[PDB]
Amino acid sequence: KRKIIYLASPYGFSQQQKTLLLPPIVRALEALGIEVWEPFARNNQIDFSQADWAYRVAQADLQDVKNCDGIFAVVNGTPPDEGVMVELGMAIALNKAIFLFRDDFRRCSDNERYPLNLMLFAGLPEIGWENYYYTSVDEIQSHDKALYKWLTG
Template identity: 75%
Template sequence: MKKTIYLANPYGFSEQQKELLLPPITEKLKSLGAEVWEPFERNNQQDFSKPGWAYIIAQADLNDVRNCDAIFAIVNGTPPDEGVMVELGVAIALNKEVFLFRDDFRRCTDSENYPLNLMIFAGLPQKGWEDYYYKSVEEIDSKHKALYKWLLEDSEIT
């Protein structure tokens, strides 16, 4: 059975970002055998002229975070997107597997250890957190990183 990854990202707000930035990330995750739940693709088919559309989308996204196996959160920006941060917080509270992606070189932190607010790393282990943190699309399928090991742990046993 495929593990599901919720791809928390702000890229769906821009057609150019959705077309250029999302596909390489989604393809890498799928190449590892994951089922990728991309929220704009799954939950944005609403009539934005009708009242209540925002609540419907928010609840659908929240439901996907509840039901996924892991979250792969794109945390670019200073600060990162608010919606991604809420989704990440929910995933951490639900003890989901957490993987972070940031190819943005800017730092926005007071911590000498982390490149972002320390709470963003609360769902990662204290030691070895770097294995759950991805700085490039090329790193996503690295055999030395946590995502590869997590996705393939069951398949290697059988």
């Protein structure tokens, strides 16, 4: 009954980023009563002596995306992370809730409407997509943006 957010990000690949950037985002989401599924913690911390470990991580992330209610995708970087992008496309196709996070002020784009490749916004409305687009950790709990509105009906 508690809504589940899959927190897709590249922050687990860097020690500093994993330790310092992910917990404030997890906490902002948990403070809204969300059950946060963070895949590096949930799925990558495995026995890497097993020949099949990478396949198993992929399948676990896949199943989590299928079972979540929404994705909160950290799309920082030039370009955004290729694994996050796969998960985002999965979420779009599965009609999950979609929320994007980018506090990187660079633009990496093929168009004038969006700060990123237009296909990242294919699951968002033509008008008002900005309401689903978070540019700071402090913005996540805003009652005037889409994540909070989704939680309150």
